[model samples]
Target: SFSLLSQITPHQRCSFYAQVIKTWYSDKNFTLYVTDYTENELFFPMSPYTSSSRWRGPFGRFSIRCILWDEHDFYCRNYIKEGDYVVMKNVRTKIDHLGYLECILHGDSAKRYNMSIEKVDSEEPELNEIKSRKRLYV
Candidate 1:
């Protein structure tokens, strides 16, 4: 089943849909900043000085970083771009050493599941619900 980002708890695995905010790729991992326009107090704080680029919306604790490993990299780098809506499965949620929440889609899970991220419509009702919420923030 799927859960909202705000409804997610640390150390639990979950699947959910969200819009990509930004993406950064390193030789080791593919990091995706995403949002469903919902806030969680435990989420990683997006301090302006900490991030290299200024993110435009769903500000504060509304979004989370998803670290995609191994096989997921080719899929994301090849197709997933900012503004695309996607559904992520077998995502492991946890508080990092910094004591803020993050999502991790491990190579183990992705290889086992055969897929992890897939594009979805901006027209999904849940995406629309988040669109409604984001309007309040924007």
Candidate 2:
């Protein structure tokens, strides 16, 4: 069964399948804007071990952000991209001072694994949906 991004609860670490919609990277940060099978947006970022450590605390169904740090940073930077379907597991969740919910991907045992991010088949039903959405943004 697929874990919908909408079902994510605060402080809960879970897995979900999603399609990458866009990616942005720079010396400051790297980020991926994605959507679940139902087209729900998930805001993900490449972050450090601790950036304003206190800002990490404990939002809603609309959109979620996931952070990838250290090795995971390189993983997302080179592997994930717009239009790719992926399954992310063992992700930790927390809310920022801004009240925004996001997932955390650190290089820890709980968050570390060779299969953390898996590519989906192009024949999947959501392929068309991803393509259509990608077009609107182009």
Candidate 3:
């Protein structure tokens, strides 16, 4: 179940974002992308999270968009579109530079089967969790 920080409690967002930033900084992904919303762009990796449009909100499968930046602070994918998320192709690459820091992120939990590098669809109630157990990004 992909969830945006917006859906979670306000008190929770800060902690979550903190951990996320920590992961990014330690992973060296931070240097690649800085938060454009903040005064200190390099101080934070990646852009701040954004809300989704009407069709993408209120129980919509994908209502979040996270823009990842590159070395030059330009979006790596330019725009990780609605319904599209990101998957680090070489987490090791960043880790190698960051001195093998442990990530608080649920990397194992997030690693669902065979989804797109950009995004993956979510499972609905009608879908049999046990039988299928996999949701591909269509």
Candidate 4:
């Protein structure tokens, strides 16, 4: 099934953001962080690649042109950002199971994005705004 979310408490959000930084984005040359855009907590990062230098990979449907990176390298780039909110759409193809809460976010402060995971051909909706795997207490 699919779920939706918008905001998360700051404390939990920060914690998960920390992991994405340490385990993901920092490994890449780019940096991710939350900038204090007056209380909005804007999520953005400075790109190391210039417009012409950025990459377009296999998943060409995405509006934001992505630079190609392996799993390890991708996570490294995932960490650095400048906003309190992170938006991700669980793609069309993937595994599904009961209690298999699909779209989930961790930390206390992280928020659910305005994206969807439902495929035109499938019945399941992408997961979002979930607190954790064991605790669907949200």
Candidate 5:
């Protein structure tokens, strides 16, 4: 039931599990930048919590932007955050600026399914590797 971000295409509807690495919201539109490092990877300049003086140091790579609308937008904005794990179902994939893959949740069908977002809990080796691969340099 899990599809890798690399394997997804615009013509297919599939489910995927990823960790939320960043978010953007405006005018009721919420976008989540997520990644499943087993399928792709992300890098950061530095861990945010560890450096108190720096405002922005980390950057991510190989992440997909998922845009939410209507109820889905409200739900995601209220519950999701960077570092959370999310399972998205029945999502439509598309290519965005610079050929990056993006996912979308729109219409009635998207809101029907109970997508899940959970706090980061498990210390699975793969997850650790994904997190650890993040770079500490710009």
Candidate 6:
């Protein structure tokens, strides 16, 4: 079942819809900051003390960092963008080295079906939730 970002826990495989608020790349992987308008306690904190630049996403622990590996990384660069609504499948959740929760899409082996990232239309419940939550802050 598709779980809300706030409902994710370590090692659980789940799919969800979210808006990509930021996209950047590392030599090893593609990175995206996404939000579903749900708040997770374990999510990376949005702090004023960290950076001077304004965060484009909703406030608090609403955004989750997604690390895309291998083919997933390739697809992100070719197709996805910041502000796009995407439906992601076969995502694994875990805490990173910094101890913050994250979503990792690592299409592990050829024997199994790889994770998928697809652009989707403005979807309901999810989109409506996102819109209403944004109004709370924006």
RMSD of 1: 2.2
How would you order the candidates by TM-score, starting with the best?
Answer: 1, 6, 5, 2, 3, 4
lDDT of each: 0.82, 0.58, 0.24, 0.23, 0.62, 0.81
Residue clash pairs of candidate 3: none
lDDT of 1: 0.82
Name every residue pair that clashes in candidate 1: none
Worst 10 residues of 2 by lDDT: 54-63
What's the CA error at residue 91 for candidate 1, in Å?
1.0
Give the distance in Å from residue 12's predicted Cα in candidate 4 to where it truly belongs: 27
- With a 3 Å backbone cut-off (N, CA, C), the pairs that clash in candidate 6 are none
Candidate 4 lDDT by residue in tens digits, 1-138? 221211222222111111111112333333222211111212122343542343211111111111213442344354433222333333121112421111222222222322221112112122121223213321
Q: Which pairs clash in model 2? A: 43-65, 58-95
Q: Which candidate number would show the highest TM-score if scored against the true structure? A: 1
Ranking by lDDT: 1, 6, 5, 2, 3, 4
Q: Per-prediction TM-score, please?
A: 0.87, 0.63, 0.21, 0.19, 0.65, 0.86
Task: Check candidate 5 and list the clashing pairs.
Answer: 45-58, 45-136
Query: Where does candidate 4 stray beyond 4 Å?
Result: 1-78, 81-83, 93-98, 103-138
lDDT of 6 by residue, 1-138 (tens): 688888988788778888888888878999999998889998888875664374578667888989999878887776787788888887878898988898888866672645677887765555777677667757
- Candidate 5: what lDDT? 0.62
Clashes of 1: 0
Candidate 2 lDDT tens digits, 32-92 = 5556533233333324453344322111133355667766677678777666777777677
Instruction: Give candidate 3's whole-model lDDT.
Output: 0.24
- Give lDDT tens digits, candidate 3, residues 1-138: 332232322112121111011112223332222011112211212222452232322222212222233331223333334333233322211122433212112223354422223222334332232113223212
TM-score of 3: 0.21
Model 1 lDDT per residue over 33-68, tens place: 999888899886777666656576455788999998
Q: Model 4, 11: alpha-carbon shift in Å?
A: 31
RMSD of 2: 8.8
Better of 4 and 5 by lDDT: 5
